[PDB]
Amino acid sequence: DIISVALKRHSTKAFDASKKLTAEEAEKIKTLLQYSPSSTNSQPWHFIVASTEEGKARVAKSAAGTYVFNERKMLDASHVVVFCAKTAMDDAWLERVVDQEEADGRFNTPEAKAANHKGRTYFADMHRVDLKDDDQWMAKQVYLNVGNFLLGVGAMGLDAVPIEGFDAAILDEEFGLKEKGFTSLVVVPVGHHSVEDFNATLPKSRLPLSTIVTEC
Amino acid sequence: DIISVALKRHSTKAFDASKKLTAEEAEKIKTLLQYSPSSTNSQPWHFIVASTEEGKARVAKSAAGTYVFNERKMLDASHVVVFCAKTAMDDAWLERVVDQEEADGRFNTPEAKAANHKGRTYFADMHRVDLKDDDQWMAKQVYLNVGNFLLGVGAMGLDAVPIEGFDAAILDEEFGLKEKGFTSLVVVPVGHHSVEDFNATLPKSRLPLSTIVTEC
Ligand SMILES: Nc1ncnc2c1ncn2[C@@H]1O[C@H](COP(=O)(O)OP(=O)(O)OC[C@H]2O[C@@H]([n+]3cccc(C(=O)O)c3)[C@H](O)[C@@H]2O)[C@@H](O)[C@H]1O
Ligand SMILES: Nc1ncnc2c1ncn2[C@@H]1O[C@H](COP(=O)(O)OP(=O)(O)OC[C@H]2O[C@@H]([n+]3cccc(C(=O)O)c3)[C@H](O)[C@@H]2O)[C@@H](O)[C@H]1O
Ligand SMILES: Cc1cc2nc3c(=O)[nH]c(=O)nc-3n(C[C@H](O)[C@H](O)[C@H](O)COP(=O)(O)O)c2cc1C
Ligand SMILES: Cc1cc2nc3c(=O)[nH]c(=O)nc-3n(C[C@H](O)[C@H](O)[C@H](O)COP(=O)(O)O)c2cc1C
Question: What radius of gyration do chain A's Cα atoms show?
């Protein structure tokens, strides 16, 4: 009942620092990150998975000052995932993706690999050259991954919260992401809620279907 | 198991037009679109759900010509969902969201509404005034919804494919989206794959964890 999951999951506001993911749950949440779809299977992303106390403290440095309300969440969760996008799409990455597809057996003929390569490069160059928005295009693929991830961990029975309330410049510098060609977009602490998670008992709220949906 | 769903779902390349969603599935997918999370619960989206022959043909107009390889997906699927983002974030929309949250009982005191209203608007003007990218910020919330949606319909046993290969200017004009304040971002046909779906029997391909994940 994935609809029941969607109506029961929520953004956790406080995590129990004594409750850790199992070894199997930790493997599964990385599978979720890995197997998210993306346009042209571009996978323009990298993920920092912080589970040690020092690692999470490094992530939490980005939630200082104006974002202090998000700091404890990053310190208290079991596993803290930093979602990162590539800052520029390059031909080396397009080759890495198509060569991984080739090794995985997705091309039955050389014609199929050449068409998959040409099609992906044509669409990536539309963003790289024509629209000059490949950084935005790739970041959108990362947000799609986040949405897949939040529903996935909810269906696993894990608590989580997506966070944009952090200083991405501080987080990027903390993990040297700019020199690697990545930038942090969303931080998602994952674990089990604590008694201070006031959002666990509040009702959900969405705009009504009469507003957001047009049936045609 | 939701990890089984993630490992088994695929982008459907051909649909069986005779396999419709059930009435119950058609109601579930609307709740699935509605209850996706979004930054500050901004819900900056609208969805066209085309299920009639005329409606699906109208959406398919956006795939004529250069994007013709996506046209039959839009025509043959049971239901076709058009994900749209608001073109600009306005104060009236933010008040609509907070009014809905209050009506649903999320605020215990008046000091809980205003701190929520000003917390949403302080972060809203971060993209409206400072970073001048609220259109991009809203689009990213819509992509997050798409990711929630593809895992969701996959958990329901339904087939789907997310489509960026369409002409948004044609789709926007066909549904008058600009005048309503929205623009089309992703088309997702939903239904059941046919035997012509060559991607149903291809192995999935993802970059390895040693590339995309840094544990700390
Ligand atoms: N792995 C594979 N192994 C074997 N054949 C493969 C194949 N991938 C495609 N094909 C071949 O492709 C043909 C149909 O192409 P199909 O996969 O439906 O679609 P495709 O040609 O890749 O894309 C259709 C349109 O959407 C655009 N677009 C935009 C964004 C993302 C993507 C995307 O694909 O992620 C595409 C693209 O620029 C183009 O204008 C078939 O004849 C099939 O044989
Ligand atoms: N519905 C509610 N009913 C009762 N109390 C409610 C409440 N909502 C917040 N509160 C109160 O707020 C406090 C906890 O704050 P908390 O919810 O953790 O956090 P919040 O105030 O929503 O935001 C924390 C930081 O993240 C930033 N941010 C950025 C982007 C998106 C979002 C977002 O929220 O989507 C936030 C925001 O600008 C701020 O710097 C407690 O004092 C709690 O009582
Ligand atoms: C991209 C994104 C960023 C968010 N940022 C924050 C945040 O910084 N801190 C926070 O406590 N909640 C944050 N939220 C949680 C939203 O307020 C929440 O998703 C929304 O109110 C809907 O509630 P729900 O997640 O319980 O269904 C964010 C959500 C998203 C999707
Ligand atoms: C935003 C987005 C746009 C996509 N556009 C297309 C498209 O236009 N036509 C298509 O057939 N597939 C499209 N795809 C499918 C991707 O090729 C597919 O998600 C990726 O190769 C991973 O495979 P999977 O979805 O089977 O796991 C798109 C996927 C995403 C997420």
Answer: 19
CATH number, domain of A68, equals 3.40.109.10
Contact A214 B100 (CB under 8 A): no
Binding-site positions of B read: 9-13, 40, 66, 70, 73, 106, 164-165, 204-206
State the greatest distance between any 2 C-alpha atoms of chain A, in Å, as a whole number. 58
Contact B141, A212 (CB under 8 A): no
* End-to-end CA gap in chain A: 26
- Closest residue to atom 11 of ligand 2, CA basis: B112
Q: Is A36 annotated as a binding residue?
A: no
Token pair belonging to A14: 């406080």
Task: Give me the number of domains chain A comprises.
Answer: 1
Phi-psi region of B184 (alpha: psi -120 to 50; beta: other; left: phi over 0): beta
| Identified catalytic residue from A56, A71, A73, A86 | A73
The residue assigned the tokens 């917390």 is: B119
DSSP one-letter string for chain A = -HHHHHHH--B-S-B-TT----HHHHHHHHHHHHH---GGG---EEEEEE-SHHHHHHHHGGG-GGGGGGHHHHHHSSEEEEEEEESS--HHHHHHHHHHHHHTT--SSHHHHHHHHHHHHHHHHIIIIIS--HHHHHHHHHHHHHHHHHHHHHHTT-EE--B--S-HHHHHHHTTHHHHTEEEEEEEEEE-B-TT-GGGTSPP----HHHHEEE-
Q: Tell me which residue range forms the domain holding B166.
A: 1-216
Query: Is the CB of A3 less than 8 angstroms away from the CB of B207?
Result: no
- Residues A67 and A61: their CA atoms lie apart, in Å, by 10
Which pairing describes strands B45-50 and A213-215: parallel, antiparallel, or unpaired? parallel
CA–CA distance, A35 with B116 (Å, rounded to integer)? 35
Label each residue of chain B as H, E or C: CHHHHHHHCCECCCECCCCCCCHHHHHHHHHHHHCCCCHHHCCCEEEEEECCHHHHHHHHHHHCHHHHHHHHHHHHCCEEEEEEEECCCCHHHHHHHHHHHHHCCCCCCHHHHHHHHHHHHHHHHHHHHHCCCHHHHHHHHHHHHHHHHHHHHHHCCCEECCECCCCHHHHHHHCCHHHHCEEEEEEEEEECECCCCHHHHCCCCCCCHHHHEEEC
Q: Count how many pairs of residues, chain A against chain B, have C-beta atoms within 8 Å.
A: 208
